[PDB]
Every structure is written in C-alpha cells, then in structure tokens.
Amino acid sequence: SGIFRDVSLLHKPTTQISDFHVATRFNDDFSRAVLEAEVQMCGELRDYLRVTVSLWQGETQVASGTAPFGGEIIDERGGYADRVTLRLNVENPKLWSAEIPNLYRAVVELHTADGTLIEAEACDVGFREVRIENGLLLLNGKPLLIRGVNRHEHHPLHGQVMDEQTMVQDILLMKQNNFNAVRCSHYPNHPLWYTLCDRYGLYVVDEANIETHGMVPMNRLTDDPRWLPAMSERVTRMVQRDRNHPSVIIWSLGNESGHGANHDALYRWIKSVDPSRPVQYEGGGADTTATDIICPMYARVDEDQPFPAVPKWSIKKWLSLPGETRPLILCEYAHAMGNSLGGFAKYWQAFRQYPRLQGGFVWDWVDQSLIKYDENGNPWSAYGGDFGDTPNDRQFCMNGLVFADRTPHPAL
Amino acid sequence: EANIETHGMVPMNRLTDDPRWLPAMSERVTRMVQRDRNHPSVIIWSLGNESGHGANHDALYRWIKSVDPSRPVQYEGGGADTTATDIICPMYARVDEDQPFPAVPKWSIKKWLSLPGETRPLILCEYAHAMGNSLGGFAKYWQAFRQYPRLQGGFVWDWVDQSLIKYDENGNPWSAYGGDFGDTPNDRQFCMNGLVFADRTPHPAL
Numbered sequence: 070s071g072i073f074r075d076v077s078l079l080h081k082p083t084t085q086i087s088d089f090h091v092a093t094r095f096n097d098d099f100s101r102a103v104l105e106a107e108v109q110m111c112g113e114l115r116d117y118l119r120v121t122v123s124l125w126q127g128e129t130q131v132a133s134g135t136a137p138f139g140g141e142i143i144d145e146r147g148g149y150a151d152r153v154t155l156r157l158n159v160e161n162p163k164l165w166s167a168e169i170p171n172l173y174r175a176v177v178e179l180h181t182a183d184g185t186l187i188e189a190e191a192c193d194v195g196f197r198e199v200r201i202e203n204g205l206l207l208l209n210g211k212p213l214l215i216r217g218v219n220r221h222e223h224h225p226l227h228g229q230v231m232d233e234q235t236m237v238q239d240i241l242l243m244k245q246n247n248f249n250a251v252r253c254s255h256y257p258n259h260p261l262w263y264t265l266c267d268r269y270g271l272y273v274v275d276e277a278n279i280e281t282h283g284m285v286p287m288n289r290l291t292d293d294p295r296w297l298p299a300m301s302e303r304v305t306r307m308v309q310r311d312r313n314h315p316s317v318i319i320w321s322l323g324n325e326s327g328h329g330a331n332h333d334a335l336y337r338w339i340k341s342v343d344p345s346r347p348v349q350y351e352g353g354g355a356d357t358t359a360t361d362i363i364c365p366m367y368a369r370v371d372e373d374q375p376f377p378a379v380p381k382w383s384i385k386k387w388l389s390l391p392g393e394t395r396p397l398i399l400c401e402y403a404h405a406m407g408n409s410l411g412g413f414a415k416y417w418q419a420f421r422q423y424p425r426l427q428g429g430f431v432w433d434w435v436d437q438s439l440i441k442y443d444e445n446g447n448p449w450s451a452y453g454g455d456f457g458d459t460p461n462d463r464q465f466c467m468n469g470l471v472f473a474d475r476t477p478h479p480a481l
Numbered sequence: 482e483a484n485i486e487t488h489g490m491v492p493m494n495r496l497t498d499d500p501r502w503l504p505a506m507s508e509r510v511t512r513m514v515q516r517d518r519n520h521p522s523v524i525i526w527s528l529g530n531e532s533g534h535g536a537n538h539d540a541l542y543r544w545i546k547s548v549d550p551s552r553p554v555q556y557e558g559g560g561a562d563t564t565a566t567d568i569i570c571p572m573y574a575r576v577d578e579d580q581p582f583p584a585v586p587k588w589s590i591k592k593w594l595s596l597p598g599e600t601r602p603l604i605l606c607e608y609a610h611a612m613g614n615s616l617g618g619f620a621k622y623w624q625a626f627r628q629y630p631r632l633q634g635g636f637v638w639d640w641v642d643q644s645l646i647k648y649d650e651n652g653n654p655w656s657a658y659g660g661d662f663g664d665t666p667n668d669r670q671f672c673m674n675g676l677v678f679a680d681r682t683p684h685p686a687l
C-alpha cells in the first residue's frame with residue numbers, strides 16, 4: 070500500500086482541451102490512410118475558437134487540418150457543439166508493428182482565428198489495423214504469432230514502484246530474447262510503459278484491475294448488479310486513459326473472476342466505444358460470450374483436463390469443437406516456477422503447425438522476490454512467509470524467467 | 482457409390498469438367514439414387530471415386546440434394562473438402578503429420594478440423610491400408626477418433642484380397658495376383674489389400 074506512483078500538479082486554461090481520440094482507417098492494401106481526430110473542449114464556446122491537428126513524421130509535416138467547433142448531426146436534437154472531428158489524408162503511410170515501430174507525432178492546437186495559441190497537446194500515432202477475420206487475428210492484414218509474456222510491476226528493493234530504467238531494461242531483455250508482446254498482468258501499468266512499448270515495438274494486452282479469485286463461487290461479485298458500477302469504473306477509465314496508444318492491440322476485462330453478466334455488459338461497452346481492438350477474457354471457461362479470443366490458462370498441447378464446469382481441453386481439440394470459429398491465444402502457459410519450461414518445444418511446434426493457434430503469453434517475466442538483510446547486513450532474496458505475513462503461499466511468488474534483479478534463468 | 486472413377490486421366494478431372502460427359506455421369510448417379518433410395522441401411526450417397534473435381538460433380542451433388550434431402554452426400558475428389566461434399570472425407574490422411582501436396586494437400590485430420598471457416602464433420606473414406614503385414618498405427622487413429630467429437634471414424638481399406646485361383650501342373654490351386662495371367666501392364670500384388678484372404682480366412686490385422 071501507499072502512494073506508489075507519481076504525484077503532479079497540472080495547470081490548464083479555463084477554455085481547454087478536455088479529450089481527444091485518434092483513429093486510423095485504411096484501404097485494402099494499406100496504401101491510403103485517413104487519420105481520424107475527434108477533439109472535445111471544456112469552458113465557454115466562442116465563435117473565434119479553432120482546432121488545428123497536424124501530423125509530423127520526425128521533422129516534416131505530412132498532413133494538417135483546421136476547423137471550428139461543432140460536430141455532425143447526431144440525433145433529433147442536433148450535434149455536439151463542443152466537439153470537432155478532423156480528417157487527415159496520409160499517402161503511403163509507414164505502418165506500425167513490433168518489427169518496425171514507425172511513429173508519427175500528432176499535435177492538437179486550440180487557438181483563436183487570429184492565430185493565438187491557447188493550449189496544445191500531443192501524442193504518438195502509429196498506423197496499424199487489428200482485426201479478427203475468418204478466425205485469425207490479423208495485424209495490418211497479416212496473421213500474428215504472439216511470442217508473449219506476462220509481466221508484473223515488481224522491483225526487489227522498491228516493491229511495486231516502477232521507474233524508467235527498470236522498464237527499459239525489461240523491454241531490452243524481452244526483445245533480445247525474441248518476445249514481441251507483453252500482457253500487463255491483471256492491472257493497468259505505469260503510463261510511461263505504453264510509450265516505451267510504442268517506441269521499441271511490443272504488442273500490449275491492457276487489462277482492467279479486476280480479479281476476484283478468492284470468492285466462492287468466484288463470480289459472486291461479477292454476477293451481482295450492485296458491483297456493476299465499480300467494475301464499470303475500472304474498465305471504462307482504463308479505456309479512456311489508454312485508447313490512443315498504438316502498442317495496445319487487445320483489451321482484457323480482468324483475470325480469474327468467473328463469468329458474470331457484468332462481464333458481458335462491459336464487453337459490449339468496449340465493443341461500442343472502441344471497435345478498433347478485440348476484447349478478451351479468460352474467466353468462466355475461456356470461451357464465453359465475453360471474449361473474442363479463446364484464451365485458456367495452462368491448457369496442454371495434447372492432453373485434456375476435464376474439470377466439471379470449466380474443462381481445460383487440449384488446445385488442438387479446443388480449436389475444432391462444434392461451432393467454434395475464434396482464434397486461440399493462451400493468456401498463460403508454461404509456468405516458469407524454478408527449474409521449469411519442460412515441454413515448451415511442443416507448444417511451439419503446435420503454434421507453427423496450426424493457423425488458428427496464434428501463440429501465447431508465458432507465465433511469467435520476473436520473480437516477485439524481496440530483499441531482506443541478515444545480522445551481518447548481507448542481502449538475501451525472500452519469498453512468502455519470510456516477513457511473518459498472515460497466511461501465505463511460500464515460494465509461489467517466484468515464477469519468472471529472470472531473477473528479481475533481472476539476471477536470466479536458464480529457461481530463458 | 483456411383484460407378485464413376487477416372488483415375489487414369491491427366492489431369493484427373495479432364496472428363497468430369499467437360500459438359501459433353503455430363504449426360505453419362507448424370508445417368509450413373511440418378512439411376513443409382515432411383516434404384517436404392519428406399520433402403521434404410523443406405524445412410525450416405527457418394528458421387529464416385531478419384532475423378533478430380535469438376536463442375537459436373539457440383540451439378541450432381543445439387544441434384545441429389547434436391548431429389549433426396551434425407552441423406553448427406555460425400556465425395557473425396559480433389560481436396561476432399563470441396564463444395565460437392567457434406568463431409569470432409571480424405572483418403573489416407575495421417576493422424577498428426579501433414580502431407581503438403583501442391584494442389585490437394587493431405588492435412589493431418591486434427592489440423593484439418595480447425596482450418597479457418599471449416600465446420601463439417603470428418604470421416605475418412607479410406608485409411609489404414611491393409612496390404613500384407615500392415616495396420617501399424619491403427620490405435621493412434623482410434624485414440625484420435627474417441628478424443629475428437631468431429632472425427633467420426635472411417636472406412637478401412639479394405640475387406641478382402643483380390644487374389645484369383647490358378648492351378649499348377651499337378652492341379653494344386655494357388656493364389657495369383659497382378660501379372661500372373663500375362664496381362665497387359667499390371668500392378669503386381671497391389672490387388673491384395675484385405676483384412677481377410679480371398680477365401681475369407683482372417684489375417685492377423687483383423
């Protein structure tokens with residue numbers, strides 16, 4: 070517990086930019102793109118107010134647009150007077166991907182008709198299209214093979230305080246070991262993480278901070294309408310914060326909370342607000358109506374695990390169950406506890422053989438061990454129960470491919 | 482099965498893609514359906530064997546579906562998963578190993594079930610070629626059949642050896658195969674693929 074992330078003061082003018090969304094559309098062969106910029110303002114509307122959106126590729130301006138406020142007619146009552154939608158045409162855009170993370174810079178200016186700048190905001194823009202077609206997850210028209218890993222925010226000395234240097238070290242190691250994707254383990258991450266993933270080229274699964282593993286029967290809260298407001302806040306605020314990051318390709322509704330009607334509601338909400346990213350969720354059997362991707366946890370390659378209500382089929386069998394057409398991406402597989410990762414080659418043979426097996430995220434990146442000191446002051450790595458902590462789960466906090474100080478294990 | 486097989490054509494569908502041969506093929510299909518449609522034991526119609534894939538096959542598939550909608554229609558021709566079959570019916574597709582031939586690949590049956598857009602059941606029209614001392618790996622097929630709901634089994638090739646009886650100078654009979662009658666270019670012992678001998682004595686593989 071504590072104030073474990075940054076604290077800051079922000080000063081804005083009374084007439085201000087309150088929100089802006091960016092969206093990219095493409096033609097069939099990705100030769101033509103249209104940058105969609107919707108800007109919302111707060112304060113008093115004046116006729117002299119204008120909004121300018123300019124797209125910069127490194128140092129040269131490639132597109133720009135200016136408009137007064139006032140959107141298109143929405144319904145019988147009219148349109149949004151405090152919103153403006155800018156459309157920019159880009160010829161032969163450079164596409165963003167983990168292999169080649171081409172980025173543009175978008176600058177949004179709120180200014181007067183005479184040319185006086187009031188306030189500016191900016192974001193990095195990546196041109197990429199994620200969609201599921203005919204049972205395959207496609208990025209820029211090509212089917213992805215996910216070489217992913219689950220990553221907690223953990224530092225052996227500072228606990229759950231994250232800093233830029235540790236994040237950069239993690240990204241470098243992951244890329245050097247042929248990972249191209251990361252799953253934010255069961256909560257939204259530090260804001261700089263998505264910027265770094267944009268710049269260095271990693272695909273990101275962004276997860277809402279919802280996990281009710283300890284309930285019996287695990288959906289007691291997520292099937293209760295009285296808890297719908299809190300869950301909705303946790304989902305909608307994450308989507309509002311992170312929707313402009315090109316590295317975020319998939320939304321996740323949480324982790325290990327069963328399956329409740331609240332999950333279906335929030336899945337539909339995300340699909341309505343942000344249709345440019347697929348939504349996944351593992352809870353309640355990994356193939357429910359609240360997921361676009363079959364995302365089992367620790368499903369085996371060839372052996373079935375028939376649990377009563379939530380069976381873990383083998384992934385090959387899972388693909389061909391009657392009526393099933395979705396792609397399969399394991400959200401957790403190859404538990405890396407200690408001396409582990411036996412049978413990894415079988416998973417990757419399966420991934421390469423089957424088109425609809427599009428990979429998975431290993432559990433997990435880094436051990437969650439903490440540093441203690443002996444009577445001589447020599448540090449040593451501690452796990453559950455070493456602090457006298459109330460009922461604990463001993464060494465199950467260390468499942469990483471690297472040590473807490475980022476030294477590789479042999480399984481890496 | 483209708484009495485249509487053009488295995489020896491190059492390409493295999495040279496006749497079945499030709500409208501001039503449509504009347505003959507149509508006779509062979511429609512007369513069989515007219516003769517046998519009342520038998521309860523007949524559960525599936527088949528359009529023939531090893532004739533490629535031609536438009537004539539699509540036409541006759543639709544004709545059968547119109548006249549007798551109470552039985553599914555299958556056909557292995559070119560690919561085993563074309564538009565002229567209700568059932569994926571490959572020939573000698575293996576359990577776990579793919580066989581990537583250029584135009585008509587033989588995927589492993591498990592992989593075949595999950596190819597994008599594929600929803601049909603899979604029943605092998607021929608598998609476990611029982612030539613001589615054979616049927617190794619049969620248990621793998623049956624493990625697969627029991628594990629996967631959409632793998633609904635198959636037909637072994639085949640029941641009885643096609644050997645003929647000849648007699649020596651002493652008059653003692655002996656079993657003969659392909660080239661033993663002086664016949665024009667032959668395929669030797671490939672006529673004997675049965676689980677039982679020609680006189681219906683079981684082989685060990687049975």
Ligand code: NA
Nearest residue numbers: 420423424426
């Ligand atoms: Na694959």
Ligand code: NA
Nearest residue numbers: 465466467468
């Ligand atoms: Na653990």
Ligand code: NA
Nearest residue numbers: 626629630632
């Ligand atoms: Na079966």
Ligand code: NA
Nearest residue numbers: 671672673674
């Ligand atoms: Na034969």
